[PDB]
Write a protein that binds this ligand. Structure first.
Ligand SMILES: Nc1nc2c(ncn2[C@@H]2O[C@H](COP(=O)(O)OP(=O)(O)O)[C@@H](O)[C@H]2O)c(=O)[nH]1
Ligand SMILES: Nc1nc2c(ncn2[C@@H]2O[C@H](COP(=O)(O)OP(=O)(O)O)[C@@H](O)[C@H]2O)c(=O)[nH]1
Lengths: 218, 236
């Protein structure tokens, strides 16, 4: 029972990555719900909040032994590799929903950046995360958990096309989706796969209860 | 000899980097587009780069195009005409993002706004984000959209094969780099994009076409766009 939202500018490979992970709400079979949404927000917030209402209403009921959890457990936020950081629309969106959903920031179409360019954009996005007091999902073995945090935000490449593993062909070379020397796709997936319970659990224990307390107080 | 080259398009599309490669070096008022204009001698060249998005920015560019027409009309209407300084925009690279499936309707209306006043040369920026197959689909979608909407881009005139193959590339999909490599280029873990490598991208054609068509761009600007502006202007 798990729900993942992907949000971001149109044309940033949002759909291709989702397809790459698993090989406007689609529901494939754990039971995964995916909600892809292209940025141009008062409906996005409201969708998220509406899933807390159903759940609060449902858990408040006399019949429970068929409750559907539609709460969004994670939101990949896609950032253009063309900016030098977060655009203020991106910051405003993330601030609108950071108290309600687990944000995982992702740099899109990372095959657009040299390694030097990549690390400048990551450093700059992390600093802006701090500067604007934005609350992104924080990961909870030794060195593999070390290396994964030290590469947030993940800069990914999607493709489901094959190359004489999946990749993208340019006259000067081939980007390999699952080569970590090429991009953080494997890390993002592994992280998604290894952290589902926590994602679910932080959604329950933190975002939903905060929703719930303000409600029963008001 | 005087040439003014303008480049417009969203920021983050490599526009300065491209310009740098050709030679190796809130917008709301005509004034600040002038302040953006750099002058180099390489022939007196002026480069005028304008980040587009807020659609007032498009109105200022238009107003700016005309002001250069105005300067000229005013200067040739006066009594001392020895050096009329020609600041009329002879060319507009229009950078389109490789992330769209074509032109947005803003681009379309804007190009319709400026297409009887400057020579639009459309350019797909950051072409190293596109596989060759993607490159073709975007080129065709962009040309279709120009037909569909009757956008008048600059028609290259007409050793033999060099004109055909150059036309075939329009709109040119280009790559710029300030960095050098072993060539100006872009180093990725998987390979190196070479700017001047025509297999890799159409930069070589853009520069060659500019270098080669500069006189005709100037002339079309004079004989067509300018005289069109001047006829309309005097009527009022
Ligand atoms: N350079 C690059 N291009 C990509 C990548 N992923 C997808 N694309 C291209 O971008 C197009 C749009 O991707 P899409 O998933 O539809 O983006 P979306 O609008 O955010 O869902 C795809 O058809 C691919 O041709 C990537 O990782 N790198
Ligand atoms: N992938 C790619 N990146 C580029 C290209 N040209 C420039 N860049 C990168 O994009 C950054 C910003 O480009 P810039 O020229 O300042 O874009 P402008 O805002 O349109 O003037 C540069 O520092 C380069 O890192 C290109 O052809 N391809």
């Amino acid at each position: 029972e798990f729900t993942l939202m992907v949000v971001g500018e149109s044309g940033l490979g949002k759909s291709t990555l989702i397809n790459s992970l698993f090989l406007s709400t689609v529901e494939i079979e754990v039971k995964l719900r995916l909600t892809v949404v292209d940025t141009p927000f008062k409906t996005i917030i409201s969708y998220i909040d509406e899933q807390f209402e159903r759940y609060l209403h449902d858990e408040s009921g006399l019949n429970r032994r068929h409750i559907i959890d539609n709460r969004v457990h994670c939101c990949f936020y896609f950032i253009s590799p063309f900016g030098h950081g977060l655009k203020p629309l991106d910051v405003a969106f993330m601030k609108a929903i950071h108290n309600k959903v687990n944000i995982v920031p992702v740099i899109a179409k990372a095959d657009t950046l040299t390694l030097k360019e990549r690390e400048r954009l990551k450093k700059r996005i992390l600093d802006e995360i701090e500067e604007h007091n934005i609350k992104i999902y924080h990961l909870p073995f030794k060195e593999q958990t070390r290396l994964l945090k030290a590469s947030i935000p993940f800069s990914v490449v999607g493709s489901n096309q094959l190359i004489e593993v999946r990749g993208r062909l340019y006259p000067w070379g081939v980007v390999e989706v699952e080569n970590p020397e090429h991009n953080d796709f494997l890390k993002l997936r592994t992280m998604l796969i290894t952290h589902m319970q926590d994602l679910q659990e932080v959604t329950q224990d933190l975002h939903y209860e905060n929703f719930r307390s303000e409600r029963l107080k008001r």
